[PDB]
């Protein structure tokens with residue numbers, strides 16, 4: 203029995219909460235580390251078993267001891283409590299880099315040499331192609347276009363919204379070209395570069411992924427991974443999402459790397475050429491390939507987002523004719539990796555008003571506000587104030603939560619100022635850092651119960667106990683979709699369906715598109 207809390211810390215001027223299982227109010231206090239009480243209040247019921255205690259009113263920085271009943275926690279208040287973790291979460295992208303010596307001076311004990319430096323064969327052909335660079339997608343060493351788009355979109359958004367917060371963190375600066383860009387753009391460029399090499403010049407279509415034919419053992423170092431590299435065929439989802447991320451890149455990078463911006467801009471346009479000339483054909487792994495499929499039956503949300511990004515890239519009202527039908531559909535307005543419409547909503551909402559119907563705009567904004575209300579209701583009745591239900595705890599549930607925090611915060615950039623927006627962000631951070639039923643901090647390297655054994659091949663195959671730090675784990679998943687979860691977790695409530703085990707890929711993997719919205723949400727809070 204113990205206190206559950208934000209194990210990274212709290213912002214001075216931010217919202218401060220802890221939890222305990224109780225059956226009644228209890229008083230609590232916080233004292234300076236060497237004795238003297240600074241704050242007292244009473245816990246209050248929040249649902250099921252849970253009592254919370256709020257100490258937002260404590261604005262003096264420090265490490266404090268929090269006592270309730272006979273229990274004690276060490277809680278930290280600081281002006282920028284999350285600067286470190288945010289830096290870690292950004293640096294994870296640099297740790298995921300493919301085909302570049304990650305030097306000890308930047309990597310520390312998790313340094314390594316270039317991996318996957320060979321060419322890839324276009325599936326069922328004798329053509330080689332170089333697709334070097336970018337990120338290992340997750341626990342494996344694949345690089346997959348579709349999930350890659352979310353990660354790039356997320357980080358460019360983080361820059362566009364929270365450049366101040368991001369300014370105070372440092373990526374692995376010496377592995378990136380000079381001149382150095384603002385951290386998010388600097389990390390992002392690596393993946394943008396790789397993605398450019400996935401577009402077939404013949405057609406403008408984009409290859410769905412480059413992977414070996416199957417996963418190596420968990421105990422494979424990146425540099426030891428010898429298996430040949432295969433490009434799975436061009437896919438509509440790959441092409442559409444590529445188009446969306448490049449169009450966005452064209453905008454954000456224009457003042458920073460104009461050669462890149464222009465080039466992305468035209469990459470985006472050629473992909474949209476492709477989309478028009480081809481059928482919305484879901485991707486399926488071809489025979490022989492057994493690595494992540496990243497499939498999707500519904501491809502209209504992807505068209506939405508490509509269209510809306512080209513709308514916002516050009517500024518040309520022409521594009522409004524294609525977007526506004528797509529915006530009218532009953533697609534779910536989510537932030538990826540498969541259901542990507544909400545990225546299109548923002549691109550459209552953040553296109554200048556001259557180019558789009560004020561009428562549609564307001565309907566879009568109306569629907570947006572109604573969706574946030576739904577999420578707020580979920581938060582209202584959840585004991586930890588997060589906008590989730592038990593059925594929402596699926597593979598990557600931390601991304602689900604974070605994508606939803608992210609929704610409120612992006613909405614503030616488009617005059618949809620929901621009153622729950624900043625309470626929900628704080629809560630999502632709290633949870634992610636250990637304010638949950640397992641008391642589990644879901645980022646490697648932080649808090650008092652950090653993630654120790656991630657399903658991450660580098661963390662497994664190096665012989666360093668501590669895993670690469672800064673990695674956000676998928677989180678609890680009630681579907682029990684690996685043999686280890688089935689073993690230990692059958693019968694546990696949804697939020698407890700998580701095990702810190704290296705074989706639990708359905709609950710304990712890491713992914714560039716799980717870190718990406720985390721970066722955005724934490725970034726948002728730092729900018730307090």
Ligand SMILES: OC[C@H]1O[C@@H](O[C@H]2[C@H](O)[C@@H](O)[C@@H](O)O[C@@H]2CO)[C@H](O)[C@@H](O)[C@@H]1O
Pocket residue numbers: 339340341342344493494495496597598676707708711712713
């Ligand atoms: O389709 C199952 C889940 O896949 C998840 O992405 C995987 C990917 O498929 C693997 O190849 C590897 O890269 O690990 C990833 C994360 O565990 C995806 O995020 C889930 O939503 C899917 O349900």
Ligand SMILES: OC[C@H]1O[C@@H](O)[C@H](O)[C@@H](O)[C@@H]1O
Pocket residue numbers: 341342417494707711
């Ligand atoms: O099905 C997906 C999973 O399969 C496992 O064999 C791999 O180790 C994981 O990295 C992968 O995500």
Ligand SMILES: [Ca+2]
Pocket residue numbers: 498500501502503504540541542
């Ligand atoms: Ca889709």
Ligand SMILES: [Co+2]
Pocket residue numbers: 660661662663664665666667668669
């Ligand atoms: Co290790």
Ligand SMILES: [Co+2]
Pocket residue numbers: 663664665
């Ligand atoms: Co070994």
Ligand SMILES: [Zn+2]
Pocket residue numbers: 299300301317318338343424
């Ligand atoms: Zn690699």
